[PDB]
């Protein structure tokens, strides 16, 4: 998609193994933020949004938390709390054309900046002067979108780059997207290390005696201490108690 009208795909109900993009192009940048990518196989995320668009290499610096510029302000804005990773790669051979690829456009003019993750596809004239443009351009009145015109004579900075920004959204419910792993038979009454949909801890597991309502997935005692959990396989409630410890 063009950057001004960028595409959003929600990814869910599946397993996210990233060994595929590892057998993908020589990456121009893999700048990932707030998460180690090498650990992106034990992810357990609830929702993942895949925003997609194309720019030139010179403009990839604007694709970062808290950035500024024509793209960051009038085209694609990222929030300061971004939790995800940004993967980009040169797509010159497919997206550059002889006289320039004029099908890729971006917004040059906007009265105010976009809010994070906002989309403005308006094509209405811009007023740089003090004359009201009545749906007419010309002097001081401009069309707000401008084509990139990708040419094979451009430097790599001006060459087309395909960019995919994965935003990892956290939560407290079924990580409907999880990582390629496996399961193991459940163990009870022993101090055991457990990994329930991402929660790692230690303790003794016991059959629960409290009535969880069908819409609940977690249990807490005072001070957010995870006291119980429902099985992602047996959908059974389990009690968690830290195994014995003390001073000597």
């Amino acid at each position, epitope marked *: 998609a063009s950057v001004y009208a960028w595409n959003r795909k929600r990814i869910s109900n599946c397993v996210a193994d990233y060994s595929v993009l590892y057998n993908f192009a020589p990456f121009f940048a893999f700048k990932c933020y707030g998460v180690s990518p090498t650990k992106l196989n034990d992810l357990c995320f609830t929702n993942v949004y895949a925003d997609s668009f194309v720019i030139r290499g010179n403009e990839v610096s604007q694709i970062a938390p808290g950035q500024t510029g024509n793209i960051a302000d009038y085209n694609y804005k990222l929030p300061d709390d971004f939790t995800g990773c940004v993967i980009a790669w040169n797509s010159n051979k497919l997206d550059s054309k*002889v*006289g320039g690829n004029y099908n890729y456009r971006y917004r040059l003019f906007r009265k105010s900046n976009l809010k994070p993750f906002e989309r403005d596809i308006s094509t209405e004239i811009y007023q740089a002067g003090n004359k009201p443009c009545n749906g007419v351009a010309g002097v001081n009145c401009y069309f707000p979108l401008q084509s990139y015109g990708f040419r094979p004579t451009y430097g790599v900075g001006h060459q087309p780059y395909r960019v995919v920004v994965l935003s990892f959204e956290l939560l407290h419910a079924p990580a409907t997207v999880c990582g390629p792993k496996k399961s193991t038979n459940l163990v009870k009454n022993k101090c055991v290390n457990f990994n329930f949909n991402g929660l790692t801890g230690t303790g003794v597991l016991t059959e629960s005696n409290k009535k969880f309502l069908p819409f609940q997935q977690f249990g807490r005692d005072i001070a957010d201490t995870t006291d119980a959990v429902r099985d992602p396989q047996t959908l059974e409630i389990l009690d968690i108690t830290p195994c014995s410890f003390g001073g000597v």
Partner: antibody
Amino acid sequence: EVRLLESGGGLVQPGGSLRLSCAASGFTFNDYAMSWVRQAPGEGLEWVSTISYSGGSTYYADSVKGRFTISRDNSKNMLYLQMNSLRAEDTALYYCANGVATADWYFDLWGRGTLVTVS
Amino acid sequence: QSALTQPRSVSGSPGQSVTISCTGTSSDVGGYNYVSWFQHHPGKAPKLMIYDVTDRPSGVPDRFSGSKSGNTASLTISGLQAEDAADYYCCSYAGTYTVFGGGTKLTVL
């Protein structure tokens, strides 16, 4: 499936005029640059002219500059070459080509060729 | 011509290797990496064997390889087979024009 077909070759007298055509089929003609490449009897391939995917950009070889005119009809999936002041060194087999399967600047798709004889 | 300068003829025996060179100018071979190599039999359409100085399109064996140094490009054919005998043309895209080499006739005796 995806095809290019040249046409419009024949015997013509030196200094005359001819219009070549290239017929596209199986793809979005207006998404791709078009070029004319020829091969004169006993000679190698010679790039003649290139037109961009839109039609608003035409490139020609110096050896046939001025006298040759390239055009395309993106509505009809047709590419055209207008050769005027046809000289004897313009006798050749003429091909249209594009880069549908590689890049805009390559020649992966070809026609069958049209034979142009200048008396 | 203005073509890239190639040897006019090279001969090889089946199973052996042959390297073919392509020398151009600083505006084509020495400018960009948009160098092509073509296999051709007069009477049929050329078949792309090498585009991008060293890259093979789909269906071209690794016996065919390409190289470039300065204004000179080089194609090397290993494991010569009888069907490799053909005319071989280098090609350079230079932005404002494309230019083919003058061609090397490979004969597999």
